[PDB]
Amino acid sequence: SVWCRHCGATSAGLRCEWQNNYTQCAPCASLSSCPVCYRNYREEDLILQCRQCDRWMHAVCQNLNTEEEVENVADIGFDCSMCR
């Protein structure tokens, strides 16, 4: 299993049905595919989380090209291009 950060439970990690039985919330959807480029993440993709829209996305899809850049903006507070 995994922990769900939304409810704190040990979880099967089922598809989100927050929006409707067929529709994830954008935050849950953003765990599996990038909301910028709409590609499924590949194992080892560098991703970070916007503090506004609560979505994960590719660092490269926000012109963050290194771990160093990703750590610096994530540390101080990351506001993605979509929310700016």
Partner: peptide, 6 residues
């Protein structure tokens, strides 16, 4: 706030 997908 930042991870690698696994």
């Amino acid at each position: 706030g930042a991870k690698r997908h696994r």
